[PDB]
Amino acid sequence: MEHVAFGSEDIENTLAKMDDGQLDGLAFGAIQLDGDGNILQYNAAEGDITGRDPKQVIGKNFFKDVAPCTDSPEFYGKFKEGVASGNLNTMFEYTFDYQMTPTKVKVHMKKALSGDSYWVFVKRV
Ligand SMILES: *C(=O)/C=C/c1ccc(O)cc1
């Protein structure tokens, strides 16, 4: 395992050192998005939660293509305000229900330490 707790205050500094292989050792799902919502990184734990194959969703748009259930003011709306503002740090519960059994999760969205990238972290509840 990589030992990093979900919700940790300095998580963006810790994850700045990991490559795709290290990200697969986290105890929670991790997605890195660009400012348009395209998927740059997608770890093994996220694929275990949602059924998606990580290598197949990299490059797709999360809000348009992969996760239309998140295209709502409650999820995408928060993301886009964060990108526009250049700051984002929010945690909320959500249900993922597209082409899968409805699954309740906790989501943490946080701006990355690098400029135009954003993390989405997911764990079951
Ligand atoms: C709603 O459409 C949610 C879909 C979804 C969430 C998270 C993922 O990693 C993949 C699909």
| The token pair that represents 76 in the structure block | 């995408």
**Tokens 């998927």 label which residue?**
39
CA nearest neighbour of 94 among 117, 68, 124: 124
| The token pair that represents 102 in the structure block | 């409805």
Pairwise CA distance, residues 48 & 36, whole Å:
25
Which of 28, 39, 58, 62 has the most ligand 1 atoms within 8 A of CB, as the residue to mutate? Answer: 62
Residue located nearest, by CA, to atom 11 of ligand 1: 67
Check residue 74 and report its DSSP letter.
T
**Tokens 């275990």 label which residue?**
48
> Could you tell me if 32 and 117 are in contact, meaning their C-beta atoms sit under 8 angstroms apart?
yes
Pairwise CA distance, residues 112 & 46, whole Å:
18
> Could you tell me if 34 and 117 are in contact, meaning their C-beta atoms sit under 8 angstroms apart?
yes
Q: Is 8 left (phi over 0), alpha (psi -120 to 50) or beta?
A: beta
Which of these CATH numbers, 3.30.930.10, 2.170.150.20, 3.40.190.10, 3.30.450.20, describes 1-125?
A: 3.30.450.20
> Could you tell me if 31 and 46 are in contact, meaning their C-beta atoms sit under 8 angstroms apart?
yes
Pairwise CA distance, residues 40 & 20, whole Å:
10
Q: Where are the domains of the chain?
A: 1-125
Q: Where are the beta strands (DSSP E) in 4-113?
A: 29-34, 39-42, 89-96, 103-111
Q: Kindly give the distance from the C-alpha atom of residue 115 to the centroid of ligand 1, in angstroms, as a whole number.
A: 24
Locate all alpha helices (DSSP H) within 16-101, ordered by sequence: 20-23, 44-50, 54-57, 76-85
Sheet-wide strand order for 89-96: 39-42, 29-34, 117-124, 103-111, 89-96
Residue 56 — φ and ψ, nearest 5°?
A: -80, -20
